[PDB]
Amino acid sequence: HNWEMNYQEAAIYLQEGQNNDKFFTHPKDARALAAYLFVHNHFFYMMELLTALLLLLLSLCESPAVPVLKLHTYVHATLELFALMVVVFELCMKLRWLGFHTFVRHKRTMVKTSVLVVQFIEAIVVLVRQTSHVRVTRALRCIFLVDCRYCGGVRRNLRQIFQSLPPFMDILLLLLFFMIIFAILGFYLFSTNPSDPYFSTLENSIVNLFVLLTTANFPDVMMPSYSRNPWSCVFFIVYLSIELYFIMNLLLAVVFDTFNDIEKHKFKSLLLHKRTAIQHAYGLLASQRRPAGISYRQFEGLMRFYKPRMSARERFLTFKALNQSNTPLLSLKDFYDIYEVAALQWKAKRNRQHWFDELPRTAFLIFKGINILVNSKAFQYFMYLVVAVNGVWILVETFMLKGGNFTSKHVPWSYLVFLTIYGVELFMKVAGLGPVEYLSSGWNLFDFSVTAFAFLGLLALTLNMEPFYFIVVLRPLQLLRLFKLKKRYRNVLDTMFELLPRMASLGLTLLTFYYSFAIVGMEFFNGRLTPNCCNTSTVADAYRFINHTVGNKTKVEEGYYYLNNFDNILNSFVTLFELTVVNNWYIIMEGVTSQTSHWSRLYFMTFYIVTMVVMTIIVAFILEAFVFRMNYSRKSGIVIEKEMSKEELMAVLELYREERGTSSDVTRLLDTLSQMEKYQQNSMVFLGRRSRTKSDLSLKMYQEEIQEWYEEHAREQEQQKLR
Amino acid sequence: HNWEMNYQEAAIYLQEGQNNDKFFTHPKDARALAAYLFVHNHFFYMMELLTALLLLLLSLCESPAVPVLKLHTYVHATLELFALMVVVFELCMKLRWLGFHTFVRHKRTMVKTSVLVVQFIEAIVVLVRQTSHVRVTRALRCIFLVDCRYCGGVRRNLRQIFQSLPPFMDILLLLLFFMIIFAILGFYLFSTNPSDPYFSTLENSIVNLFVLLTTANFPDVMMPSYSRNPWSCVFFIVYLSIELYFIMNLLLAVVFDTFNDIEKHKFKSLLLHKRTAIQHAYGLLASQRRPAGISYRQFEGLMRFYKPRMSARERFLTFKALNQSNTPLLSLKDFYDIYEVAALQWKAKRNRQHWFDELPRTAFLIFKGINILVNSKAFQYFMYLVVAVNGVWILVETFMLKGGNFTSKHVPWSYLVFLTIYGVELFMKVAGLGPVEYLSSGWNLFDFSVTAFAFLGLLALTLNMEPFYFIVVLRPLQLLRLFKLKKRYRNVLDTMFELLPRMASLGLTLLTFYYSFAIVGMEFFNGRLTPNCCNTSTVADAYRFINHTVGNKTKVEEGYYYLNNFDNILNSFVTLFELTVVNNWYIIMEGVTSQTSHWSRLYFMTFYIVTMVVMTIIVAFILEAFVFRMNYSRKSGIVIEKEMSKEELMAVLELYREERGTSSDVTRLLDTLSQMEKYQQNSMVFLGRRSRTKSDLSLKMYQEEIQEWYEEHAREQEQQKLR
Ligand SMILES: CCCCCCCC(=O)OC[C@H](COP(=O)(O)O[C@@H]1[C@H](O)[C@H](OP(=O)(O)O)[C@@H](O)[C@H](OP(=O)(O)O)[C@H]1O)OC(=O)CCCCCCC
Ligand SMILES: CCCCCCCC(=O)OC[C@H](COP(=O)(O)O[C@@H]1[C@H](O)[C@H](OP(=O)(O)O)[C@@H](O)[C@H](OP(=O)(O)O)[C@H]1O)OC(=O)CCCCCCC
Ligand SMILES: *[C@@H]1O[C@H](CO)[C@@H](O[C@@H]2O[C@H](CO)[C@@H](O)[C@H](O)[C@H]2NC(C)=O)[C@H](O)[C@H]1NC(C)=O
Ligand SMILES: *[C@@H]1O[C@H](CO)[C@@H](O[C@@H]2O[C@H](CO)[C@@H](O)[C@H](O)[C@H]2NC(C)=O)[C@H](O)[C@H]1NC(C)=O
Ligand SMILES: *[C@@H]1O[C@H](CO)[C@@H](O)[C@H](O)[C@H]1NC(C)=O
Ligand SMILES: *[C@@H]1O[C@H](CO)[C@@H](O)[C@H](O)[C@H]1NC(C)=O
């Protein structure tokens, strides 16, 4: 009962190194062991995520409501109380695992408890008083989704944005200084003209030069001055040159470069925190004998507690992939690579087909015939020729019918001809190659998806479900097969499906900024923007709704900007998307400040600066990884190839018979005894594979400075171990 | 007469290495020597620049004319003929220096000759027919300003933009594909509504989605669809996410990264071309004796032909700065650094003041008193306190008079008080420190400039020149002294005045693109945009001019976009500046295509793509140098310090007395004999200094990969010298 506890403890060191969890709270007794095992399941993590996500989606039914998803007050009050009681349960369990003095000194959980208390109080107050009072405190509910376990990549990306901020504030102050001094000069220089609303007072000049900084009103702010004297253009050319190009691009460059340094040091601390965890494990399950290493028995002991649900054959394969020195041990120089070998799935190599050992003759020659045709290199060039003729046919047919062919109910017979060609090619390729060897490649999956989508649209249209005619409209997506002919598109699309979870983990951070601004925007600008209001401002042309009664036609004209409300969480989300895309944001701004005070100008200006810093950091960081991996693809997942013999299995099998483990492991090794006998051979070659994570790109980016990190790390450990 | 020709030839090798000129055309005979000396003066270079710049400014008087600078047809025809005859003179002289077979095989001069012939022909045709016909061929006159000698940094920056182009065209084709396929889907999906002009035909959908790619009409193109069904926002969110953010930022990232690689290889070829020039010079004027090096006599021979107008004292100082091994020779390892030592100016070190050896007592104690006060560290903190009180006074005074104080004729007496403080501080600092030691620093130059500017505005206002009141309006530029208190602003402003010629050399390339587009735009869209036209389009609201006659006021309302003409070269320059700043470009586009055909849509789309690639490359390249030199300034011109003794001057003086050179050199060395005797010392310490060029930043950027370049270069030379 000793070595199994060493195995459990060493697997805890590896999980605790993976999840970036501090080594002071490593469990020693059985009480802290059971608490650690109670918290770190996948049930508890999914309970955190479902509770937090239900709370954010509970904001969809509260007091500014989508009118069909509206509940009464006591219903969503008690749902809010129930979800907060689940959060109390989770903080009690983490308080059970960690100590009290470790719990209090961790700042994120303490802020989470204070937000928990305030949300609990106003939930009870809304439950008693029967009416929702203000509810601005909802905007702090992003901390329940950030502080979970699956959203670590969101939490770190927010923290590094707020840590990139002190170089931003300095040059921002340099920006606002020149903006004010050109507002003073502009007020003196252009206010005597009675024919402009722009430079009339001081706040009109300061607001209009802040909007001109975003270039949202550039010709319109210059024209009443440019009509009087044509030398008034010098003011705006000098202003845009100094302020926009030089200073604002200097601002974004400085913020992004401190963001890269902060990420580089965060990745450094993550590698070094993994490395000490491996060193504690090797300290725990070494031999302490005349050889210094790890035997196969202890490595079996790691893999039966770290990464369970794993075959004994796969376990032996990972051991031989870690050996690398051909002695029956593991040194630290070869045990420093657990995380990148224990994460790969092992497959055998079989050269037979999946339709030949089952059927007899005279269809055996058929499936041989289809395999020869589908792997002939003339069938491929023929199919590219079919795609090219299809595209030229579509283009000439749009020049014939003047683009009017995309409105009729009548399916062209040419569409039926090409759909039969891609269909027959789909059956011949999926049968002559095998459906396992068909869904392997991504392009075959794309062609199957598009062609089966077009059969669905064709069948639904002959079923007279006319809203499914847009599938018939999307014909030229079949021309997207033609892009694998060029090399650079293969690089772009492979990198696009490699960097996809990282892009989702950054879009979620941008959605957190939208969520807090949308809740403040709902509770203060709820019922202001109506049709045909704001007629005392300069934006009366845009909030208008005029009927006419010529004939019996009741033709209406309207300016449509009364639809950018803050009535719901959904109308406010599409409004904040219209403010991220920078154009015409001053119209929504000055409509709201026509109805409310001027401090709502302060709202929209703050949202502009926040969304611009966040958007440049997200786009630049993703595209730096994107360009690096394309150029690396022109410098040259990963595939390892190892093998075993039957002589290397005689040592393995009697150990499982002697130690008396489970039964499925033993019978698995009996099955590979049979598979060695059927082919009449001893040495059998296996094949390992795993998909690229973001840490592999981060190792290839910073490759020239990693050994320096490990040397400085070992020196720091010698400072602690000499003391 | 032998060694002087070796000196002349070696100085030609160093000039030919500096100017990036090929070594096949090195002159051998006296004929090619006199031709090389006739071409490479500073008179010939300034003749090239003045001819080309007069030709581009001759386009200001031609047939679309600024109406006050308008000439007749024969006057500017003969000016065009005279300037082209000067260009014929220059090509005849370069044909005199280079061979014929070298002249023909150089592509830039051959294109320059063909443009010379065509411009010569249509100049004669305009001179005969008395009316200007079309004159689109003017747009190729940028090649006369690019192909000169002072505009090498413009020529290289244009060439690398056109060499960055094949990765651009590929992803641009990927952009236009998804734009068309969403135009087909959008035409099907939103055309049945009678209340929108956007998706009505096919060309309206393709044009409006190309404009939506620039985000110039984003809310307005969505709103008539978003009013019908609110789920129509999914189309535009998916379109902007895939097309704008991902693909367009991928486009700009790929173009900028190939631009950096092209610049890296161009800088590599420039260093290696300098290095072979130094190797030819060391081959030419070595000893060929028992020591292998360069004596002082031959190094005097270089400096009397390379870098003339140089003292013999400065010549000896550069030799001792090149020695670095304390033997009377120069090896190649210390002669590889000519260009960075021969470019620095040498000064002595003197600790006396400039107002003490002239005046007697009782004012000697006065100027001592002002020096002690101006260097006291309490006078400085006092002056910062004066600036801070001045700024708080300005802010509170704008809150008092509601910003209305910037309109009155009355000068505030507070302005007179602070102006007397800065004036007295200016005289006390410029007298207590010395005007040579006052104009050294940049901030003192700034404070002198601002304060003397304010005396000029005050004196002109008491002279009742009321248009000089804007100097009184620009009070808060005196608050810009307060920014040297923080470290990061000192870094930003020092880097801004270091990277300034490079920024001018990139703005000139952007002006060449404006020039060619402005000439095509003048000759095809001359008299189209009038007041109150284009009333059949959707932009009738913007080209309008309506009078009213209420009372006797004749108040007018107008839409002002008829002022963005193409009538002149100046109206077209401010119009193209309004198209670089992206906002509201489709209004100018659809006004022009209301008057002309649809191929002018093809004009404005091409100009958008060109100006976007050029603007991102310019901004990103400058800001990469900017951030690198700020972070390098937190890692740690250049200053060298060498000395000589009188014993080291006894060797120098008798060589100039024996060889019998000039007289001013000998008398200069007699003057430093006197300056050594007056202080009663032998060793005297001198001080060298030069300002940072762009090649020093380029050496510090690529520092980790330069020795690899020199090794590969030496291997290439051994491949040629073994054969
Ligand atoms: C406006 C907020 C600006 C925040 C900008 C400052 C952000 C900031 O530096 O974190 C410092 C701490 C939070 O820091 P905190 O997150 O509590 O603690 C860190 C995490 O534990 C991190 O784990 P993961 O990141 O999950 O992997 C760990 O690696 C770090 O250890 P290390 O140092 O050895 O690397 C810890 O220092 O304190 C707060 O920030 C409280 C936040 C309360 C929020 C209040 C308002 C909602
Ligand atoms: C639309 C034009 C696109 C141009 C994009 C291609 C530009 C391009 O690659 O240069 C190739 C040559 C010009 O090349 P060209 O300039 O004539 O010749 C180069 C220069 O002499 C350069 O000196 P500097 O640049 O002054 O320092 C030198 O270093 C290079 O030698 P190296 O290789 O050993 O380094 C030469 O190859 O040919 C043309 O380009 C003719 C241009 C006529 C313009 C016609 C229309 C106005
Ligand atoms: C601008 O809109 C306001 C609505 O807030 C208009 O005020 C109303 O005018 C009508 C008749 O003109 C009156 O019957 C209402 O009582 C007014 N409402 C209020 C709250 O006073 C105003 O007339 C409009 N101004 C225009 C069109 O110039
Ligand atoms: C649109 O503009 C055209 C100008 O091209 C106007 O046509 C002119 O109309 C006036 C009187 O309506 C006639 O005297 C002119 O002879 C017309 N010009 C031409 C060239 O025929 C037209 O009226 C305008 N339409 C509007 C304002 O609805
Ligand atoms: C316009 O007419 C509709 C009915 O056709 C009516 O409901 C609406 O209130 C009218 N809008 C006005 C008068 O502003
Ligand atoms: C408007 O009135 C001015 C005179 O004040 C006149 O010159 C101009 O032509 C008028 N514009 C019209 C009638 O469109």
UniProtKB/Swiss-Prot annotation, chains A, B:
Pfam families from the UniProt entry: Ion_trans (PF00520)
Transferase among the record's keywords? no
**Catalyses which reaction?**
Na(+)(in) = Na(+)(out); Ca(2+)(in) = Ca(2+)(out)
Write out the entry's keywords from A to Z.
Answer: Calcium, Calcium channel, Calcium transport, Coiled coil, Endosome, Glycoprotein, Ion channel, Ion transport, Lysosome, Membrane, Repeat, Transmembrane, Transmembrane helix, Transport, Voltage-gated channel
- Tell me the null mutant phenotype: TPCN1 and TPCN2 double knockouts are viable, fertile, have no obvious morphological abnormalities, and no obvious behavioral defects. After fasting for 3 days, they are less active and endurance performance is reduced by 8.3 fold in contrast to wild-type littermates that show no changes. Two days after re-introduction of food, mutants regain endurance and become as active as before fasting.
Post-translational modifications reported in the UniProt record: N-glycosylated.
Its Gene Ontology biological processes?
A: endocytosis involved in viral entry into host cell; positive regulation of autophagy; sodium ion transmembrane transport
- Identify its protein family: Belongs to the calcium channel alpha-1 subunit (TC 1.A.1.11) family. Two pore calcium channel subfamily.
> What does it do?
Intracellular channel initially characterized as a non-selective Ca(2+)-permeable channel activated by NAADP (nicotinic acid adenine dinucleotide phosphate), it is also a voltage-gated highly-selective Na(+) channel activated directly by PI(3,5)P2 (phosphatidylinositol 3,5-bisphosphate) that senses pH changes and confers electrical excitability to organelles. Localizes to the early and recycling endosomes membranes where it plays a role in the uptake and processing of proteins and regulates organellar membrane excitability, membrane trafficking and pH homeostasis.
The protein here is known as Two pore calcium channel protein 1
Organism listed in the record: Mus musculus
Gene (name only): Tpcn1
